XYZ file of N, CA and C in Angstrom:
327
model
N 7.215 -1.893 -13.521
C 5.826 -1.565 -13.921
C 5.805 -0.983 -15.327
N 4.592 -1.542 -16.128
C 4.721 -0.920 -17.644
C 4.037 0.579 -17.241
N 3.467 0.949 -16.337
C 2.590 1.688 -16.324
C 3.030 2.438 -14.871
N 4.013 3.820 -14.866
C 4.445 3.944 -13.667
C 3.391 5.100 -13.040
N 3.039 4.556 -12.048
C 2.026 5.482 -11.018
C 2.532 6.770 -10.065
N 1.889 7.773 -10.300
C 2.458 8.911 -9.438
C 1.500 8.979 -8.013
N 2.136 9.414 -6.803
C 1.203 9.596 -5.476
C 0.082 9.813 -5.785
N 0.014 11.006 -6.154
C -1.027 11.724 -6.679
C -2.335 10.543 -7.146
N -1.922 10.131 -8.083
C -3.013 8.501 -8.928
C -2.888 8.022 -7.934
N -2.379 7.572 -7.233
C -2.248 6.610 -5.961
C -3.172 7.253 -4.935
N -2.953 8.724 -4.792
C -4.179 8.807 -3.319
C -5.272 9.119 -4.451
N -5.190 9.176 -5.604
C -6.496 9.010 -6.245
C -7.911 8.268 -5.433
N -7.521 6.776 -5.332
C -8.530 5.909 -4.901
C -8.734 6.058 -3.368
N -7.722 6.661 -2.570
C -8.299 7.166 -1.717
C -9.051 8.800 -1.223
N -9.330 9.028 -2.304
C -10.179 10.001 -2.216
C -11.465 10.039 -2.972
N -11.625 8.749 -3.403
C -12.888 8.126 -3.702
C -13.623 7.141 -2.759
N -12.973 6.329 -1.711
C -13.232 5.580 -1.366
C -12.481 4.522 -0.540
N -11.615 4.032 -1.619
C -10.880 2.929 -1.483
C -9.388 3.336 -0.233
N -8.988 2.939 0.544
C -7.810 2.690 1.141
C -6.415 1.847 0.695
N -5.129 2.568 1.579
C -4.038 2.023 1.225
C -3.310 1.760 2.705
N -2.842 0.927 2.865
C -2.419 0.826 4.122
C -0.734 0.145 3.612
N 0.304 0.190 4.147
C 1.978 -0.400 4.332
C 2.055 -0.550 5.411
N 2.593 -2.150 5.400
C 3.110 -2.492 6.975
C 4.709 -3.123 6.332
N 5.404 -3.078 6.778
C 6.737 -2.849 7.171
C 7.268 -3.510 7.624
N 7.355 -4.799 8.109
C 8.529 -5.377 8.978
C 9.688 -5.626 8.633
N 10.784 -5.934 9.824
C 12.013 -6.231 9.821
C 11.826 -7.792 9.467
N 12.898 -8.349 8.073
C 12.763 -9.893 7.849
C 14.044 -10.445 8.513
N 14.093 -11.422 8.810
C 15.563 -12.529 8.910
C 16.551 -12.153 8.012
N 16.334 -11.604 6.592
C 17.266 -11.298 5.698
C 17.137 -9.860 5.739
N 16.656 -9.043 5.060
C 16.086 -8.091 4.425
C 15.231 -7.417 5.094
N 15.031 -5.777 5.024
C 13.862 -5.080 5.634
C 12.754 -5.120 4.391
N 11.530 -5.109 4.772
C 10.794 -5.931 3.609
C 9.374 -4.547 4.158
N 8.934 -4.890 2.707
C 6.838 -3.814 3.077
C 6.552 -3.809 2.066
N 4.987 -4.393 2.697
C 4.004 -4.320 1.600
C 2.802 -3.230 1.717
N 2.602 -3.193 0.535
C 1.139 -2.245 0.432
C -0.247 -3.197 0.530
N -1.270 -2.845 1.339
C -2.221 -3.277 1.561
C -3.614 -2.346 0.448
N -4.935 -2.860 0.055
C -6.019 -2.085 -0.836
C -6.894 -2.597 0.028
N -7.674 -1.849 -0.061
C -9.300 -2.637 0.400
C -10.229 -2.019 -0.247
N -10.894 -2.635 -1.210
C -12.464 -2.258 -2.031
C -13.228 -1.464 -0.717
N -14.198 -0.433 -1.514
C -14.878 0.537 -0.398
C -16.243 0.372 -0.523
N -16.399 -0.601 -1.283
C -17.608 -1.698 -1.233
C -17.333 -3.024 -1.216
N -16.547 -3.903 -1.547
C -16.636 -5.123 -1.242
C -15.215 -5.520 -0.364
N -14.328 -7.034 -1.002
C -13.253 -7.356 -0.081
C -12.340 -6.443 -0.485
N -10.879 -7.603 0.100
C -9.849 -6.519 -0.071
C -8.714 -7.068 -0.500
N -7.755 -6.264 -1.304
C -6.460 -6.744 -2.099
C -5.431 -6.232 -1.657
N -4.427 -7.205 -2.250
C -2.712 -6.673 -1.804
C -2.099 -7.349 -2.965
N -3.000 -8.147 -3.592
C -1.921 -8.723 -5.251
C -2.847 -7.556 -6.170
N -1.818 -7.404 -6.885
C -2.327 -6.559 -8.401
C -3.664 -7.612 -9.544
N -3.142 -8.709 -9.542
C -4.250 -9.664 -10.291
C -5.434 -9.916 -9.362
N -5.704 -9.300 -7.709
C -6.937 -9.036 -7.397
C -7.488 -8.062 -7.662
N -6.676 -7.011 -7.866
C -7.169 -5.539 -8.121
C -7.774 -5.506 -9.585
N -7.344 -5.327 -10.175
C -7.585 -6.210 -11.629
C -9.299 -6.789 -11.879
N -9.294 -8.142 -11.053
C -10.447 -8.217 -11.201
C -11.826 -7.742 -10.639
N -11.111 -6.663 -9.281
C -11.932 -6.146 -8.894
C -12.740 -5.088 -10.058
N -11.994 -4.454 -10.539
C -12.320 -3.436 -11.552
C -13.092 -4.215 -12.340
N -12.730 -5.315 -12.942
C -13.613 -6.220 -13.956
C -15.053 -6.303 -13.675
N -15.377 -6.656 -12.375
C -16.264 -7.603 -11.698
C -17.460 -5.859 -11.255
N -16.785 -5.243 -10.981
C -17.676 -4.367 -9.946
C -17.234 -2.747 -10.764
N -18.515 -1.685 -10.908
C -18.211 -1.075 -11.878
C -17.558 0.516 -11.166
N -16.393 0.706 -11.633
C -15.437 1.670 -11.844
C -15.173 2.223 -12.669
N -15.021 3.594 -12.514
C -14.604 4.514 -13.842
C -13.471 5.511 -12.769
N -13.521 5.921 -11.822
C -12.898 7.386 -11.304
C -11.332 6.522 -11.129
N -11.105 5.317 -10.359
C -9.666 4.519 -10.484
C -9.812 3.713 -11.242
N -8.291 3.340 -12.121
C -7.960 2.294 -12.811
C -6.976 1.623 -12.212
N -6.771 -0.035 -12.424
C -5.500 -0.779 -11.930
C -3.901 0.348 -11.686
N -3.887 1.544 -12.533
C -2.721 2.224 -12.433
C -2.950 3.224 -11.273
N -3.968 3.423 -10.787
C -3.977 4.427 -9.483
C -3.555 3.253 -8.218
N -3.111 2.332 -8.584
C -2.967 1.070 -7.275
C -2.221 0.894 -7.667
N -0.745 0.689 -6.597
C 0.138 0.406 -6.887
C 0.783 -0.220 -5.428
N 1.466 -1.220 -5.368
C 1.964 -1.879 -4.424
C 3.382 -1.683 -3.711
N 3.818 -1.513 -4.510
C 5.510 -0.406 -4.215
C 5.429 0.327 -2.631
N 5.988 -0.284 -1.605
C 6.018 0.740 -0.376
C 6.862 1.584 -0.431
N 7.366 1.799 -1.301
C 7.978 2.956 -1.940
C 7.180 3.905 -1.866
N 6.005 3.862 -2.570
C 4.812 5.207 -2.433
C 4.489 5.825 -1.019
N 4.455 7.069 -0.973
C 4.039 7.408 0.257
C 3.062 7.947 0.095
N 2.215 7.445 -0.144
C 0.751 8.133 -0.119
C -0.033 7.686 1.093
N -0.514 6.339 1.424
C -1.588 6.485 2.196
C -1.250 6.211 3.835
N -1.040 5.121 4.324
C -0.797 5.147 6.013
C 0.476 4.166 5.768
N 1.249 4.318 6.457
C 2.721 3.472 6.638
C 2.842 3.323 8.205
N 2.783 2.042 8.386
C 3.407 1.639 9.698
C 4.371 0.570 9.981
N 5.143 0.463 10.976
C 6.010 -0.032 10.995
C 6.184 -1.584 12.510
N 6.409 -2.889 12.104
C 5.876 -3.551 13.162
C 7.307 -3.645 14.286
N 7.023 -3.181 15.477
C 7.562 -3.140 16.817
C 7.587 -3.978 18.037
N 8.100 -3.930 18.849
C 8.395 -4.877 19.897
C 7.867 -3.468 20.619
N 7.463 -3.987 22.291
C 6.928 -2.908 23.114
C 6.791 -3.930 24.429
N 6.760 -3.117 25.646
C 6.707 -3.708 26.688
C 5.459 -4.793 26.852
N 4.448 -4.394 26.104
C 3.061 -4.362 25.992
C 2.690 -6.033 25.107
N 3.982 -5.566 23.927
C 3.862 -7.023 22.688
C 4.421 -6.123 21.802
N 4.110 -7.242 20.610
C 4.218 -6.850 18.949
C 3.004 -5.809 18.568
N 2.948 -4.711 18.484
C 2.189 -3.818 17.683
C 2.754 -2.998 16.429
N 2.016 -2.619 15.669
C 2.134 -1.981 14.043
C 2.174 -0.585 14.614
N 2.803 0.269 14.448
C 3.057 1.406 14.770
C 3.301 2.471 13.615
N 2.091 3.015 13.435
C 2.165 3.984 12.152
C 3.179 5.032 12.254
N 4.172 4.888 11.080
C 4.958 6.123 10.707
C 4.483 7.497 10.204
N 4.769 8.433 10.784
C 4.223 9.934 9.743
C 5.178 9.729 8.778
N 4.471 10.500 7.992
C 5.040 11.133 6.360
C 6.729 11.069 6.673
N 7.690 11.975 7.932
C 8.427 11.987 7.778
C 9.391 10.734 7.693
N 8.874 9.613 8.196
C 9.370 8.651 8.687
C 9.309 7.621 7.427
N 8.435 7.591 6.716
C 8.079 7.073 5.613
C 9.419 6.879 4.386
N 9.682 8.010 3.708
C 11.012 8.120 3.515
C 12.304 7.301 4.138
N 12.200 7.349 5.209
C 13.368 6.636 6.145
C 13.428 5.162 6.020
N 12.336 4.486 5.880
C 12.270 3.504 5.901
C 11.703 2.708 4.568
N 11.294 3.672 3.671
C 11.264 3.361 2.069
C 12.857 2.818 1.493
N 13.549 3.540 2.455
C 14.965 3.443 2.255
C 15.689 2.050 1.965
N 15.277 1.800 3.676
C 15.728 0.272 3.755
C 15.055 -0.639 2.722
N 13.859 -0.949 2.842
C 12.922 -1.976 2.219
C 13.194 -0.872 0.929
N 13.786 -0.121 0.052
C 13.506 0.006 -1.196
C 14.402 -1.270 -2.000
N 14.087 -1.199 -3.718
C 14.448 -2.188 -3.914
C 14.215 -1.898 -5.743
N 15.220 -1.458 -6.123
C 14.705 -1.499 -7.920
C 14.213 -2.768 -8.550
């Protein structure tokens, strides 16, 4: 990133509005997670060149493209993790502590 984002800028937009959600799964290769956005008026993003034009299109001043950041590295907003269960496949949110743990695996310079 030319432009490196701190938590802090990151729960920025969720304390305006906007949401962050990480889901997590285990891949065939690799432990892998992405960060999820959703506009708090219109749709919703997970690429940076949607975020982008969201800002373009619809008017913002309190976040910029740098308070969003996709890195599940960040632990700012909800992290969950997808599971097997007697029940099925469900997303099973990690707390804060757990977050870390599994930034681990799926991290990735």
């Amino acid at each position: 990133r030319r432009r490196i984002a701190t938590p802090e800028e990151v729960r920025l937009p969720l304390q305006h509005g906007w949401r962050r959600e990480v889901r997590i799964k285990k891949g065939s290769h690799r432990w892998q997670g992405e960060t999820w956005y959703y506009g708090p008026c219109g749709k919703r993003m997970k690429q940076f060149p949607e975020v982008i034009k969201y800002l373009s299109r619809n008017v913002v001043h309190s976040v910029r493209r740098e308070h969003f950041s996709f890195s599940p590295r960040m632990p700012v907003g909800d992290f969950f993790e997808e599971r097997d269960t007697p029940e099925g496949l469900q997303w099973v949110q990690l707390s804060a502590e757990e977050i870390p743990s599994r930034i681990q695996a799926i991290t990735g310079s």
